[PDB]
Subunit: 261 residues, 4 copies
């Protein structure tokens, strides 16, 4: 007689949406690209290397996903705009942007090399502006879009030797609020996704350091490293209609680290 | 099967103060995601009849009667429910009240009433349920916060104190209970048309101010809170702990 | 040519410090008196408060006392109104009285929950409301609410205390929202870790101290005199455009993982 | 008593460098710090402006010198700081004040304006803090005060890139604390609300903005620049020796309220 229905849960589906993930040739970006595709999105692989991005997109199509690619260095403003505009003209609309590309360089701030400072600013901060601006012109024209900026625990709490990275991630957290202030009126939700400590290549030296890992497990209420699949749920949520009234916020996925001494 | 990340099959959610308002909306949303739900009201006939209407709509639904402000009464009702109906795996601490006046004019009875419902009540129900969640080694606790967990508005300083308290109490639940497989998080709504906010909805000047103050340019609609609640109740948020997620159309991110 | 520095002087101002019979409150009372304030010692014990005020006077300070339990709303209001009329205006309020009770939240006794709420949260409301009525009417006043690291970051076994201190941090913003228009600056002062009787169990535990020193960028416990500068600043004209804020004095603890 | 209490805040025997102190908040803070007893160093990109101001402070009875550099030029800053330390002496207090503002909706924002903001407001803080901190760390004491903004916390339309720079500076401040508190450095932020300087000329001249601001601010008014001196002296003095990694907002209540 009765029929159980699922309206509030169905709003998590991404069917009919296209997501571009910057730096999705490997790492968290590739993990999130697959998670968003599984949730129904067409995806766009981004890498600086054309052959790599095109081949990865083809492997997604072999698995039945809708996938394409867009080649650019996020730090190159004009190059990014040309690639985004060409993709919109030839392929179609980008409805979700995940600003994932990023790098890490560790040293005490008094010894930090200026070239390392500059490289971090170009990728982690200039890059987020370059791709968001280029995509947002098209989202504004359509009156809807999602922008998800990958942040960090260092958007809130500092650690020794990574002061420049923390500067870039505090910048992205505020740039996210600024995207909301300028674009919420056009139906765009711009939010931050801040992972805690995840076992990945960016952090391999930390994972392999027994002293650091012992400290991290005591420091984190959850008592462990995160694993990258644990970010997919948050990314899907922020990309979906289920979060249409979430805007300007940064969601920390860190096992409780930022909530505790 | 990507939606499976967010499904609540086999879990039961209790929503305090779910006879009307946001609590009723969240109960429906969690049930649609697959949870069995528990209606809470201080009036047994109202709670039980609402649960019956959920069951008529194909949802698994029961009820539990208590005033969240009464510590021993809550514990007795939660323990009785756990023994007679079954495990509560998700707790939404939603019951709350509002009383507005400049702080220099605030009546101590109103101060006390806000503290009892919005702050004691979160402790009373969370402690009673968490004893059982700890024994099972898993649970979700979602505490309903507010914009006033972060930004103050004139005439609601005592409410803001309760919602700042609940935001920190949420971090404290994580600190004590993450080791037992419990994730405790806050969900802070912006502005929604419920009876809590009747005076604001009916004030054209306030509504005009709110639409300019909110980047999204409008009031929220209560169903826009279900996604965040389902996320924080599901395995999709198992590595989210001690956080408060604001669902406010951008209000707290902007001047 | 010292204008900007004379903005820290408190001459001509009177400061009430709740719970100033011992601990941080007594330290802050002395610090404010040294900066020129007349001070009011508060304790629940009439003889203790009277003795402390007399000894401050013996050292050349202007001091009086006002006896009340911060948790008792009517008793606080009566004592504040009586003092305002008999002795004179209170221009600075330091809401310092507070308690701590530690236990895992699932075992927390409701009597201990209630005690923490009554002192740490009701108490701040009770004294702030009573004093602010007078300050608002005069058009000037400073309210300084003593917060904690637990206004922002939790620690196991002190979730109820954290609730009270998160409440006080937001109540501070609400005081600003209602009262800044009347010339009141209401701000929070959040100490990090200090060796008072509040924290005796922590001071006495070398493993806790080892954790704290490694957790704190400054690498040490604070010393209670290191709180006086912040209190004088927030009590003085030097902070007339600071409002609704909570200043953490914690050696960097809350800024770091 | 009074000597003991004011002693907390006195800056006698200390030297403060204020970047971009040719005008605006930086010049006001330079005067406030000198009034509290500090020897001061005026910084401007133009030698004749910095030299003239430093002489004017000396004519008024203050100890004052000048150091010319563009905060955005890493190697130039390093050479200028090291030369000042070698020839004149220790810099004990650094106020990273130099900054600019460029306003446009983000989708129309010019890359040249984005880059200008990053170079001054973010690179510049790194460039001068690194150069000075090397000396402070070696001595085992120092104060760094980074000028932030309401936009270190709350966004406003048309200034998203500036907000990015000020969120960056707020976190960089925490990073300075994490790396250098162990060496006796206190690094903190001072975030002004709204003040009538040339930075904000377009806002002062916009009656609708001013109307909005006075309603938005619990204090109900613009700040006056002298209201920032107290916070700067506090963060430069012994009174703040256990304050580290924090950003103090001086904004009349703005960031605390809806
Ligand atoms: N625990 C964590 O790992 C963690 C925690 C918090 C935040 N995050 C953030 O998560 C994001 C992804 O990090 P990850 O851990 O996946 O690091 P990763 O394994 O090192 O991957 C970084 C990705 O960014 C790409 N990339 C770098 N510079 C680029 C540029 N100029 N243009 C285009 N793509 C570029 C890389 O491509 P190439 O192969 O060409 O190098 C790679 O695909 C970053 O923003 C990082 O800050 C990570
Ligand atoms: N825009 C918004 O509405 C908004 C924004 C931010 C936060 N919130 C929060 O959302 C929650 C729900 O509020 P609402 O807007 O839905 O308000 P509402 O329509 O007034 O509903 C409040 C609910 O709580 C119940 N309740 C009150 N005191 C209770 C007690 N002692 N024991 C048990 N139940 C009790 C009420 O039951 P009765 O029918 O018996 O009165 C009612 O079901 C509250 O925590 C509120 O602070 C709301
Ligand atoms: N590291 C720290 O010590 C630390 C850190 C952060 C925040 N704090 C805060 O700093 C404040 C002072 O704490 P403390 O460290 O100085 O603690 P303490 O040594 O235990 O002193 C607490 C003071 O409050 C008084 N008090 C307690 N309940 C009272 C009541 N009902 N009415 C009036 N006075 C009452 C006590 O008087 P009796 O002698 O009658 O008990 C005593 O003078 C508290 O708000 C505390 O939360 C302390
Ligand atoms: N309400 C406010 O005014 C307000 C609010 C919040 C934060 N702030 C911050 O306060 C600081 C001072 O701003 P303000 O209001 O005083 O602005 P202002 O009147 O425009 O002054 C800015 C100062 O920085 C200097 N400067 C700019 N770029 C420089 C560079 N590359 N190298 C060296 N000096 C440089 C300027 O020198 P020139 O004379 O050569 O241009 C000028 O002396 C900035 O960091 C600003 O973001 C201001």
């Amino acid at each position: 007689h009765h029929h159980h229905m699922t309206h509030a849960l169905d709003r998590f589906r991404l069917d009919g949406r296209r997501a571009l993930i910057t730096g999705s040739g490997r790492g968290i970006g590739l993990t999130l690209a697959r998670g968003l595709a599984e949730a129904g999105a067409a995806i766009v692989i981004n890498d600086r290397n054309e052959e790599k991005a095109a081949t990865l997109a083809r492997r997604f199509r072999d698995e039945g996903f809708a996938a394409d690619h867009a080649v650019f260095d996020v730090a190159e403003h004009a190059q990014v705009r040309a690639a985004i505009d060409e993709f919109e003209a030839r392929v179609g609309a980008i409805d979700i942007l995940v600003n994932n590309a990023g790098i890490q360089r560790r040293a005490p701030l008094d010894a930090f090399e200026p070239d390392d400072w500059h490289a971090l600013m170009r990728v982690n901060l200039d890059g987020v502006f370059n791709v968001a601006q280029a995509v947002a012109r098209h989202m504004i024209a359509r009156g809807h879009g999602k922008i998800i900026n990958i942040c960090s625990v260092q958007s809130e709490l500092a650690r020794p030797t990574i002061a420049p990275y923390a500067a870039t991630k505090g910048a992205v957290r505020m740039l996210t609020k600024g995207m909301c202030a300028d674009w919420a009126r056009y139906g765009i939700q711009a939010n931050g996704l801040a992972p805690g400590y995840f076992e990945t290549e960016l952090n391999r030296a930390l994972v392999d350091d027994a002293a650091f890992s012992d400290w991290l497990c005591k420091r984190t209420p959850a008592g462990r490293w995160g694993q990258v699949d644990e970010l997919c749920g948050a990314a899907i949520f922020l990309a979906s209609a289920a979060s249409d009234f979430v805007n300007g916020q940064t969601l920390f996925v860190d096992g409780g680290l930022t909530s505790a001494v």
